[PDB]
Enzyme design. Structure first.
Site, short mmCIF file in Angstrom:
data_model
loop_
_atom_site.label_atom_id
_atom_site.label_comp_id
_atom_site.label_asym_id
_atom_site.label_seq_id
_atom_site.Cartn_x
_atom_site.Cartn_y
_atom_site.Cartn_z
N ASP A 100 -1.16 4.47 5.50
CA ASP A 100 0.08 4.03 6.12
C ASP A 100 0.02 4.20 7.64
OD1 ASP A 100 0.68 4.41 3.29
OD2 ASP A 100 2.78 4.13 3.86
N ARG A 140 -2.60 0.44 -1.85
CA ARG A 140 -2.65 0.80 -0.44
C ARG A 140 -2.07 2.19 -0.23
NH1 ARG A 140 2.43 -1.94 -0.68
NH2 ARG A 140 3.87 -0.20 -0.32
N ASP A 191 2.80 2.97 10.61
CA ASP A 191 3.95 2.25 11.14
C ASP A 191 4.19 2.62 12.60
OD1 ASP A 191 5.20 0.90 8.59
OD2 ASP A 191 4.77 2.98 8.01
N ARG A 200 -7.26 1.03 1.64
CA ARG A 200 -7.11 1.07 0.19
C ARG A 200 -8.19 1.95 -0.44
NH1 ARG A 200 -4.89 -4.26 -2.70
NH2 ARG A 200 -2.78 -4.06 -1.82
#
Length: 158
Positions: free
Chosen positions: A95, A92, A97, A82
């Site tokens: 990233d 936020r 994933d 953040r």
């Protein structure tokens, strides 16, 4: 093993936001920095105004649990992912994933190794193409097989 992770920041700093996940992706227990493509820079959204979508690829050696490995990155995204702004930090931006997890498939309510949103994007496959241009997705699909079938416009390096 090895999980293909991605990196996306909505900031315009000299890898100041990516550096957080960069070191954290390698800070994930039971793993360690194995590979990391270059940082791209996809154009805005068009009508509105999207920032320098810095999309990058990673190849961590996480032998953890696909769900934990997900919680880990997700934890870094929220924990140390953040932006700061005085006494009122920002949202936020970091990233991370799990695009893939070695050579397995889940697609569960909590898990989804075959990144349900990677075989249909033009800014998440390129990065992986910089480290696995011939990535044979668990299900069998091929990162190239998708880029050639869609011919997604290449992105410039951040």
């Amino acid at each position: 093993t090895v999980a293909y992770i991605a990196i996306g920041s909505n900031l315009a700093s000299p890898l100041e936001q990516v550096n957080a996940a960069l070191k954290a992706l390698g800070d994930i227990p039971e793993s360690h920095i194995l590979t990391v493509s270059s940082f791209y820079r996809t154009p805005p959204l068009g009508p509105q105004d999207q920032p320098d979508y810095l999309n990058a690829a990673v190849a961590l050696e996480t032998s953890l649990a696909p769900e934990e490995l997900l919680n880990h990155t997700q934890r870094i995204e929220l924990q140390q992912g953040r932006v700061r702004k005085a006494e009122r930090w920002g949202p936020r931006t970091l990233d991370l994933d799990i695009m893939l997890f070695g050579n397995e498939v889940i697609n569960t309510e909590r898990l989804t190794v075959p990144h349900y949103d990677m075989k249909n994007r033009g800014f998440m496959l390129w990065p992986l193409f910089e480290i696995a241009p011939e990535l044979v997705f668990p299900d069998g699909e091929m990162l190239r097989q998708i880029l050639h079938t869609r011919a997604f416009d290449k992105l410039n390096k951040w």
